[PDB]
Amino acid sequence: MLRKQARQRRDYLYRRALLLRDAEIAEKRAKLRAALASGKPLDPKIANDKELRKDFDYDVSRDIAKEQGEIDIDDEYSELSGIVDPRVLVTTSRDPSSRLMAFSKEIRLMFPTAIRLNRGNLILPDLVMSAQRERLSDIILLHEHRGTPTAITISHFPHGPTLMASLHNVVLRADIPKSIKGTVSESYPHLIFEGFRTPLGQRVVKILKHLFPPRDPTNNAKSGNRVITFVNQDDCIEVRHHVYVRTNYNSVELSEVGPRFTMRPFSITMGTLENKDADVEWHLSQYTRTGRKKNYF
Amino acid sequence: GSQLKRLKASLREQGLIGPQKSKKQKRQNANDQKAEALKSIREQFNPFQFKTNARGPKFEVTTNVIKGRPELSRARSEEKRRQ
Amino acid sequence: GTPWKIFKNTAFIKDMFNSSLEIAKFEGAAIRTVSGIRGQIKRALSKPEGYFRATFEDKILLSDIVILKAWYPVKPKQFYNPATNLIGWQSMRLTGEIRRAENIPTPQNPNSTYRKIERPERHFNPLRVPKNLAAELPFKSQIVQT
Amino acid sequence: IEELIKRRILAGEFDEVLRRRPDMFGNPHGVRRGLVADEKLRRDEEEIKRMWKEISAKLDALSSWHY
Amino acid sequence: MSSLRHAIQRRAHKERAQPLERQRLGILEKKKDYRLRARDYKKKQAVLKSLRQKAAERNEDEFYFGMMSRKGPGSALTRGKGFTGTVDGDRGNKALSVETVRLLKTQD
Amino acid sequence: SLLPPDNEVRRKHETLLLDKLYDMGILSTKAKLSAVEHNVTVSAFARRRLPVVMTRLRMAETVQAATKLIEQGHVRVGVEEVRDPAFLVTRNMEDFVTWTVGSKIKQNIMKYRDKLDDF
RNA sequence: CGCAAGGCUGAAAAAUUGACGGAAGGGCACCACCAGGGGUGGAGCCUGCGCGCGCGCUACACUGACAGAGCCAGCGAGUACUCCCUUGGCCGAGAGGCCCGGGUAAACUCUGUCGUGCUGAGGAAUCCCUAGUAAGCGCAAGUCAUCAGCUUGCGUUGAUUACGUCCCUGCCCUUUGUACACACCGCCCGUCGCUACUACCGAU
Prior knowledge:
Chain D: It is found in: Nucleus, Nucleolus. The structure is cut from a larger assembly and holds chains A, B, C, D, E and F. By secondary structure, chain C is an alpha+beta fold. Chain C is 14% helix and 18% strand. By secondary structure, chain E is mainly α. Helix content of chain E is 41%, strand content 0%.
């Protein structure tokens, strides 16, 4: 099986490089299709590239289908997007403290298809092996400072990306009294996102919203009573977990039930949790001259 | 009880969410408060506005719960840091 | 300052501050080595009073010196002679004349004077592959060491 | 953030990935499984359908029924 | 330009040195020495990363014929204390037959 | 390619053809009918045959050595041995083409890595 | 450059598809029952958060002390790593370097000497936990965010008790759909909205 996962990872990276080359070509093919239906004159290299003419007559249809959005991009999520329910486990670091254990239980309650596993003495390659063995969608680590969490590592499987993010301003579920809080309602939640426009922001939105089960589309606009919000300002994505009831047609009442984070992503690696040598995709560029002026996501 | 169910129970007691009453029911009500009630409901059902201890007091002493507003305190200290 | 203990990235710096108060004033600061490595003063240390933790780009060396480049405001002095030459006036002497008058030598630092450095040709150690990796890699790239 | 949640919930636009039917490709209308010129173009489409049946048979048999 | 500056513009800036109260620790690392260190360490990390990729993507069922004519690295268990992951290389000395040893010993 | 570009059966059979060929490992991508037009190749089928795919998987040193081996009957794929050197390994069986059970080749590999388990 | 760019004005709906429930029946949950375990909460240290609160760390004796003997790990290699600051003295015109003083495991096993002796294991409450899990033990590293009052790895020793149940506490879902054979089941319930029509009541 591990042979199969290695083979698929290598073939996916090779198809990525092939898509890079073919997109460098198909930037030039699309000018030919647009100049055809319009009549505006085009560049002579485009007009006299004969191999481009043969290949264009072959492969018109995929560009048009991409324009109509009928087809999806070669991605780690478009294979199993909304067909299966992506189950996810949360663990702590090696020696968990009691507050980190309660916090992991809080976010295991936040994701409705999550299970929590104790680390104990569980070597991290055996963790990745067991996850790929039981077909888990995603894995989550947590690192405490002293009873307060500081880092998540959202890792997708079998070979997807990881997002390593630092946490601040966290308030745990397990500090308010049980007379005021209660058992959190486990329902399939809606998700709202705000501020993401770049391709990197879209990548983060995808690898975040592919941790939640897909919702039934027949009456999703009206039913459902629990929403999870991710807003970003100056690339520190802040997340709350609300549960709401709609007292009218023109007013709603909120009630904050989950933890609050302002997680700031400091790495996204194209390669899973065990692969420290995986090719990075974005990391928090500090110690440069303008790494604090530039705003990603 | 859960947060959602307790909130719905409190609003049905407050009459803000109940079934669509008839004109006869509106007459009965106009024959026979909610502001302070609703402010208490929002204060009690958004409990992360203020830092609270779960254990309660360590030693019970009887004589005659919020323990600080971190958002309000941060806004006030930031205004002082401004000025 | 001067490095005290040097890990792969983070390094503790000793002879730069006198107290955790001063460090907590200069928290989040843009420290810099002589070699060109930027870095950041991050958090005061506790057990020796005055030392701190800095996160650098790459591994700094025990021979390095950490500097912090701040800008101190200077204001001139408000002296004003009028040069009433026809009446008589006191002319303030200069630095060299003051020193030649009251017999004080000009200050100099032997740390400061320019000298020539002797750089030996920097040779590095060879590659040192760990035992388990060198045992586990396939037959095509197994190292052969007699 | 509370106001943005209120705006979204009222004018409901959630970014939830919606459960797509698993066989939208081979079954576009999703019929129930129980009790129930353009001529030149249709002829060409029938020709390609026959060609694809034949070539898929050849390709499966060449792959030795691992497909 | 290059004729629009004086010789005092062109005058080189001197390089400071390690303070004399700290000369024992070695030479003061300036920018050029730092670049030497960065190139060396990045090169070694590059080769180590390529070896890690190779050891990960090793097929466990390979079969050359050097595997019939060499002595593989084994494990710590089999090789004992003198165990480096490298395969032992042939020093060129060999086992000598008795006749040739008689001839060499007659010459000796 | 000769159908009009907007035709539903053209799109469905294009995706079907590309998926079938990529799963059978002839092509390298699954997005270019042009790659079907001048990339599908008897050389591609030949390199998807068994001895060359085990050469790429480094079972043997050369393709001649691989053919000699699997004619001697050392190489199973899945659970059944294969004696024909023309078996076409697809991209799901490339992860399963291994040696046979009591092979002298398997013993020699184990003896090289000094992990020969005689049980 | 032009349009945008002229104030009956002065802060706090849709519905033939809608609103809210009730009764029954299921399923799930160490935020539930059940059996046990372990924390925190007692004393001291301190990061943190708002004098207080938790999180870790240390100490508190039968599970003892002392002395011998034997026997076990894994991840770790950047011409790189050092805990101080000083009394003296050597060689130093001067800046320094020397020399001497002061402030690859834990464990475990076996064998003996001695005998409980300020030399006392944590209330109410509340939280967590079901197999290489709890817990004990040390070694390494310090990886652009966080972390030395610590963080993350890695190995070692490794149990008790459930592994059923919806009875309590909750959460979800059925009472519409989504598939056809055998086989079974047999019109769940309330208060209103909206719509069509019918006539009625009283002002203009």
